[PDB]
Structure formats: structure tokens, C-alpha cells
Amino acid sequence: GGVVVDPKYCAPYPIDMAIVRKDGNFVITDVNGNLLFKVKEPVFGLHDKRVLLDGSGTPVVTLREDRWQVFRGGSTDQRDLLYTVKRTKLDVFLGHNKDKRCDFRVKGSWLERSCVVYAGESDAIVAQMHRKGKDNFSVTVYPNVDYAFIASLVVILDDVNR
Numbered sequence: 001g002g003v004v005v006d007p008k009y010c011a012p013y014p015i016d017m018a019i020v021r022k023d024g025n026f027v028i029t030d031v032n033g034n035l036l037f038k039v040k041e042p043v044f045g046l047h048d049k050r051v052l053l054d055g056s057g058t059p060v061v062t063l064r065e066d067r068w069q070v071f072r073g074g075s076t077d078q079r080d081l082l083y084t085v086k087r088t089k090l091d092v093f094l095g096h097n098k099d100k101r102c103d104f105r106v107k108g109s110w111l112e113r114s115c116v117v118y119a120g121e122s123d124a125i126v127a128q129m130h131r132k133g134k135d136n137f138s139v140t141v142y143p144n145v146d147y148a149f150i151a152s153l154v155v156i157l158d159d160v161n162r
């Protein structure tokens with residue numbers, strides 16, 4: 001129940017991710033500064049879309065805007081819908097979830113650096129923010145949880161804040 005975007009984003013150990021900034025553009029790195037995703041608005045003067053690119057520059061997911069849909073790769077086609085996020089703080093519904101138990105939830109506070117992501121059907125914690133151009137926090141993604149999925153949530157939280 002940890003795979004959302006792609007099983008290749010599910011590591012057997014915890015991974016801590018963080019935001020590095022130079023505005024919707026920034027990078028998400030591991031603890032050691034290794035790039036995991038570049039986050040950007042793909043089109044100038046349009047602010048409704050962000051893409052997460054891997055280190056090779058390949059789109060991993062596209063987020064499109066209190067309601068976001070997140071699509072596979074560089075798509076915004078409905079057939080490529082992975083999940084919808086609705087604004088305790090955020091509820092996530094996988095693309096095949098036609099109803100309204102959410103599949104994941106985010107609670108806690110962005111500004112306190114205390115966000116926690118839970119799996120809906122067990123309420124298991126899948127990721128946890130901790131307070132520390134580096135933002136003052138990291139997010140632990142637990143083993144076998146999809147870290148591209150968690151990185152997309154971090155992107156949405158940042159959007160809500162800005």
C-alpha cells in the first residue's frame with residue numbers, strides 16, 4: 001500500500017528529503033545534497049501547473065491546480081491521473097477512488113514543521129516532517145513508501161503556504 005507513482009520510488013530504508021531554493025521553482029534533495037527532484041512551473045506566466053523532474057530531466061509527475069490533481073509524467077490527460085488532493089490539512093484520493101474515504105491524509109502544521117502523512121485505511125504514518133537557501137526542515141519517508149508521492153505532497157504544502 002506504499003506505491004502510488006512508481007514502485008521504483010520505494011526504498012528499503014528511510015530517506016530524509018529537504019528543499020533547496022535559489023517562486024514555484026526549487027529542488028528537493030536527500031540529506032547529503034543529492035538531487036531527488038527539480039520542481040518547476042513548466043510554462044512562463046502560467047501558475048496553475050508544476051512538474052517534478054528527476055535528475056535526468058524526465059518528468060515524474062505533473063501537478064495541476066483547494067484542489068490539485070497529479071498525473072503521471074508530463075501529462076494532464078485524465079487517463080494519466082494518479083490522485084487528487086483536496087484541502088486535517090490535506091486529503092488524498094487515488095485516481096480509482098470514485099468516492100469519500102481518503103487514501104492518505106496530511107495533518108500537522110507546515111509553519112511548525114510538523115506535518116505528518118498517514119495511510120488512510122490503517123492510519124500508519126508514511127512520512128514525517130522535522131524542524132531543523134535550505135528550508136529549516138526535512139521530511140522522513142519511511143521504508144517502502146513512495147518518495148515521489150511524498151515529494152509531490154511537499155510541493156502542494158509549499159503551494160498552500162505561498
